[PDB]
Design a protein around this ligand. Structure first.
Ligand SMILES: O=C(O)[C@H]1O[C@@H](O[C@H]2[C@H](O)[C@H](O)[C@H](O[C@H]3[C@H](O)[C@H](O)[C@H](O[C@H]4[C@H](O)[C@H](O)[C@H](O[C@H]5[C@H](O)[C@H](O)[C@H](O[C@H]6[C@H](O)[C@H](O)[C@H](O)O[C@@H]6C(=O)O)O[C@H]5C(=O)O)O[C@@H]4C(=O)O)O[C@@H]3C(=O)O)O[C@@H]2C(=O)O)[C@@H](O)[C@@H](O)[C@@H]1O
Ligand SMILES: O=C(O)[C@H]1O[C@@H](O[C@H]2[C@H](O)[C@H](O)[C@H](O[C@H]3[C@H](O)[C@H](O)[C@H](O[C@H]4[C@H](O)[C@H](O)[C@H](O)O[C@@H]4C(=O)O)O[C@@H]3C(=O)O)O[C@@H]2C(=O)O)[C@@H](O)[C@@H](O)[C@@H]1O
Length: 229
């Protein structure tokens, strides 16, 4: 069937003007100019006339937008302590994921060193001794090591059938995440990352630890924007 390009409507043009698409790995799939120019494929198309839909199969593969300097610029890098407020907003519909998909990262703050933040859908996970299922989680790094003390993981919300709003705010070395209008991470310390000048937003679908290499993660965005005030 005919695949409609995300750029065929106005809703996502502001973010497409500030993003490249990485697919099926971190390799460039489409520059900002190509995205604005109607790039489209099964991995990245306008679903039901209104959703920017990302699809990807395979371990650690992705179909993800990566924040760029606007108007055809190169990769952006900012700092948690640069004094600017860095904000990403979205409205996301996470459908029920097919068998074999276990975790899908849908928004991030990443840098040249490590991910400061991942917001992910996760099928099943115990957090602080409590089992949660089919939910949206934040994983914040407060270190570069691999032991659990390097992470703060939070149950943000159970997955809903309908769209769920997100706002990620970074200001003065602190992180706030608001989900459906309510703060769920309230001023998390990011000062471990002071001086890291290579941070940037991402959003889309990044497939983490699937149990089938052919199972396709699928995530729909009704809205996505990133801004610096
Ligand atoms: O579950 C567990 O076992 C544990 O997992 C933990 O969480 C981890 C998580 O599961 C996941 O593995 C995650 O991976 C990160 C990690 O940093 C990866 O290395 C990778 O990082 C990407 C990055 O996102 C970005 O795409 C980057 O892009 C670069 C790259 O150079 C690329 O080739 C391209 O180069 C460009 C340049 O821009 C250049 O300027 C010019 O443009 O030319 C080249 C070009 O054209 O090729 O773009 C670059 C860019 O845009 O910056 O490439 C990275 C990569 O190596 O692929 O992705 C992951 C991510 O996206 O987050 O790491 C998690 C972790 O370690 O924290 C925890 O949950 C733990 O609790 C748990 O036990
Ligand atoms: O199998 C193929 O040939 C292609 O399938 C493509 O994925 C499909 C899915 O398999 C589903 O059929 C999906 O259904 C959509 C509905 O069309 C509808 O948009 C629905 O909208 C929801 C909304 O998301 C929200 O939850 C709201 O609250 O309720 C709405 C509602 O109830 O209508 O959401 C469904 C969904 O997203 O699951 O449509 C997709 C599709 O892309 O059209 C794809 O895998 C493609 O590569 C295959 O070729």
């Amino acid at each position: 069937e005919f695949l409609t390009a995300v750029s065929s409507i106005d809703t996502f043009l502001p973010v497409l003007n500030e993003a490249k698409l990485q697919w099926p790995t971190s390799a460039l799939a489409a520059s900002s100019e190509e995205l604005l120019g109607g790039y489209v494929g099964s991995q990245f198309y306008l679903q039901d006339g209104k959703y920017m839909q990302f699809q990807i199969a395979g371990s650690s593969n992705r179909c993800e937008l990566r924040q760029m300097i606007p108007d055809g610029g190169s990769e952006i890098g900012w700092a948690v302590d640069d004094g600017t407020t860095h904000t990403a907003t979205s409205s996301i519909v996470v459908p029920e994921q097919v068998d074999g998909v276990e975790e899908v990262t849908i928004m991030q703050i990443n840098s040249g060193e490590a991910p400061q933040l991942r917001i992910s859908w996760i099928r099943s996970k115990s957090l602080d001794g409590v089992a949660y299922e089919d939910f949206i989680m934040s994983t914040v790094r407060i270190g570069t090591g691999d032991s659990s003390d390097n992470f703060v993981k939070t149950h943000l919300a159970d997955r809903t059938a309908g769209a769920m709003s997100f706002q990620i705010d970074v200001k003065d070395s602190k992180l706030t995440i608001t989900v459906n209008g309510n703060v769920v991470v309230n001023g998390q310390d990011l000062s471990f990352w002071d001086g890291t000048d290579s941070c940037y937003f991402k959003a889309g679908a990044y497939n983490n630890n699937p149990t089938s290499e052919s199972a396709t993660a699928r995530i729909k965005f009704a809205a996505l924007a990133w801004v610096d005030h």
